[PDB]
Design a binder for this molecule. Structure first.
Ligand SMILES: NC[C@H]1O[C@H](O[C@H]2[C@H](O)[C@@H](O[C@H]3O[C@H](CO)[C@@H](O)[C@H](N)[C@H]3O)[C@H](N)C[C@@H]2N)[C@H](N)[C@@H](O)[C@@H]1O
Ligand SMILES: [Mg+2]
Ligand SMILES: [Mg+2]
Length: 268
């Protein structure tokens, strides 16, 4: 029988979500199983669980990010440059590959959306505007990004059937780790500025693997390795949300662990 909003809220409370919390979810809807009203049921449950003073932050990206089409070039290729849509935060759909729940989050009334087209973050709650801006090119997951502010805001990572590789906040640890050999990428995104499309080319840390040994397309990357080690070494509330094995992780603690993990393994 499909899970109801009330059942999910009670499960979230059992896992340790409290009114007023700042939560970043990573969801496998397949693991959760059927929901009374589809994915919206779990969105509504998350909002109820954090309450009217709580906040949700999600990494939603953009269905049409021209990442692969511009990667490695000093400017967008001519055909891309002429016809790609500018990123419009009000209308651009979320990227399906990071979870189908994210499009429901981003379209929720009052949701705010960050300006970085590839790293776009959506937030719901009283602190949403403060969470989502600034989000500049060159600051995808590191200092000055919404992730940085999430980590300063008592953030909790709510993994609902998701694997250790899903922990986006660990890209902050990669950004700040004092290690040699860090990989960077160059790409271009089409922004809206005063109603006009402006292409911006930037470099940033490689979010597909901070060192060569973490950058195999299949993984495992550093996020996955760090998170697997952390979860083997730390008390973390675990329990069901819907049909999904779930965990509620202190974000600052896992990111600090990840910085240490990288710096212990890689020369400065
Ligand atoms: N590397 C191994 C990991 O790979 C993917 O996760 C990555 C994404 O690939 C990356 O995406 C970027 O590169 C994509 C491919 O070019 C673009 O499509 C996308 N627009 C662009 O933002 C995110 N920023 C960070 C995330 N950890 C898998 N989901 C994950 O399970 C696996 O562990
Ligand atoms: Mg508050
Ligand atoms: Mg809207």
């Amino acid at each position: 029988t499909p899970w109801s909003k009330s059942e999910l809220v009670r499960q979230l409370r059992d896992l340790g979500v409290r009114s007023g919390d700042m939560v970043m979810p990573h969801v496998s809807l397949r693991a959760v199983g059927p929901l009374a009203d589809g994915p919206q049921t779990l969105v509504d449950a998350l909002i109820e669980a954090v309450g009217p003073t709580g906040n949700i932050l999600a990494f939603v990206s953009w269905r049409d990010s021209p990442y692969e089409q511009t990667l490695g070039h000093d400017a967008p290729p001519a055909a891309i440059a002429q016809s790609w849509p500018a990123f419009d935060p009000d209308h651009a759909p979320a990227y399906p590959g990071f979870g189908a729940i994210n499009e429901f989050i981003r379209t929720y009334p009052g949701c705010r959306r960050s300006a970085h087209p590839d790293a776009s973050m959506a937030a719901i709650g009283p602190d949403a505007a403060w969470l989502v801006a600034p989000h500049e090119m060159g600051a995808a997951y590191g200092p000055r990004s919404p992730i940085a502010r999430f980590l300063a805001h008592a953030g909790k990572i709510l993994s609902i059937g998701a694997g250790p590789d899903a922990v986006t906040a660990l890209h902050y640890a990669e950004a700040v780790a004092r290690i040699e050999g860090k990989r960077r990428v160059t790409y271009s995104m089409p922004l809206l500025r005063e109603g006009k499309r402006v292409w911006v080319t930037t470099s940033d840390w490689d979010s597909n693997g901070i060192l060569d040994e973490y950058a195999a397309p299949d993984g495992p990357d550093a996020v996955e390795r760090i998170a697997r080690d952390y979860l083997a070494r730390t008390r973390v509330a675990q329990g069901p949300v819907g049909g999904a094995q779930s965990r509620l992780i202190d974000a600052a603690d896992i990111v600090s662990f990840g910085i240490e993990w990288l710096e212990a393994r890689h020369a400065a």
